Design a binder for this molecule. Structure first.
Ligand SMILES: N=C(N)NCCC[C@@H](C(=O)O)N1CCC1=O
Ligand SMILES: O=C(O)CCC(=O)C(=O)O
Ligand SMILES: [Fe+3]
Length: 315
């Protein structure tokens, strides 16, 4: 699902201006400011976000296109390391992630991942491990983010400050609502609420993940093409059928500056196709944040946007 927000550029730049200019120096205060500001988002945007937050969509994602973003010459050089300096001045796309994110829920950091930071720069790095956001020429295969984590976030948000030079990197999204009809009843039944072994991402180095769960007529999805590891042959067969159906309903988003993609991380799996970096200071640069909501299991009470949580595997 996509919406063009170009007309709201002036209003959104004004809301971004309300926020503290050094977010990381006091992230709780920054996000509280973003929460107050999210109450004044343009009506069209507030409605679109509230609707997607409550109902999801058939395609599992909401793409906000044409949000404000700096001219390329005014952006810093694309980062070459992580984590980001705490004193880094606020970037417009980060302000959008603050506003849109707080309208949806609570930004969450994960202790063992990216030093526990909340805002992650997603850029290519030479010699990247194959299972990392730093990859470029190697396809980053389908994964439901932290599917193996008990405190897995409802949304993964990606805002784009720079696309890759040739605009070949595609963010792929496959939705359980489109894939499910393609599976037979026995396969659905086998997957539903059935715990299967799942490895974890490098940062967290098992877990048990239910590939499908919840209401049988509209289940949630937990899938990872690299980490999910069924052993029983019936389980492997069912996951292979699920994998094929997800491929068959794959949709692609070519992120460009000003785009903010909201992925329903309980109903999709996502990936990124290859691109060739130039190491010239203008390489692809996205900003990633994770949002927790009241959808069950994520929050137990007293949480604030900006909190960092520890690792506990599902099981
Ligand atoms: N199939 C996979 N699990 N691929 C790795 C996903 C990217 C990775 C990263 O940020 O480098 N990550 C996502 C959460 C985490 O860690
Ligand atoms: O680069 C992208 O478009 C998505 C990256 C991603 O999914 C990840 O690093 O977890
Ligand atoms: Fe991801």
């Amino acid at each position: 699902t996509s919406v063009d927000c170009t007309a709201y550029g002036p209003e959104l730049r004004a809301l971004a201006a309300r926020l503290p200019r050094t977010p990381r120096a006091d992230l709780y205060a920054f996000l509280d400011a973003a929460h107050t500001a999210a109450a004044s988002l343009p009506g069209a945007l507030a409605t679109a976000l509230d609707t997607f937050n409550a109902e999801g969509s058939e395609d599992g994602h909401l793409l906000l296109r044409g949000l404000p973003v700096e001219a390329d010459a005014d952006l810093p050089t694309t980062p070459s390391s992580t984590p980001a300096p705490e004193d880094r001045s606020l970037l417009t796309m980060e302000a959008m992630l603050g506003l849109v994110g707080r309208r949806l829920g609570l930004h969450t950091g994960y202790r063992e991942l990216r030093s526990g930071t909340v805002y992650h720069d997603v850029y290519p790095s030479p010699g990247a491990h194959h299972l990392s956001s730093e990859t470029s020429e190697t396809l980053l295969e389908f994964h439901t983010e932290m599917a193996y984590h008990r405190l897995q976030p409802n949304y993964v948000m990606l805002a784009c400050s720079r696309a890759d030079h040739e605009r070949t990197a595609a963010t792929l999204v496959a939705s359980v609502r489109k894939a499910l009809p393609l599976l037979d009843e026995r396969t659905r039944a086998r997957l539903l609420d059935r715990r299967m072994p799942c490895c974890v991402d490098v940062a967290f180095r098992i877990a048990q993940v239910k590939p499908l769960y919840g209401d049988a007529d509209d289940p949630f999805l937990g899938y990872d093409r690299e980490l999910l590891a069924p052993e029983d042959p019936a389980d492997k067969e069912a996951v292979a059928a699920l994998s094929k159906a997800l491929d068959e309903v794959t949709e692609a988003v070519y992120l460009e500056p000003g785009d903010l993609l909201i992925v329903d991380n309980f109903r999709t799996t996502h990936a990124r196709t290859p691109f060739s970096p130039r190491w010239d200071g203008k390489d692809r640069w996205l900003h990633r944040v994770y949002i927790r909501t009241d959808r069950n299991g994520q929050l137990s009470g007293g949480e604030r946007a900006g909190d960092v949580v520890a690792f506990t595997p599902r099981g």
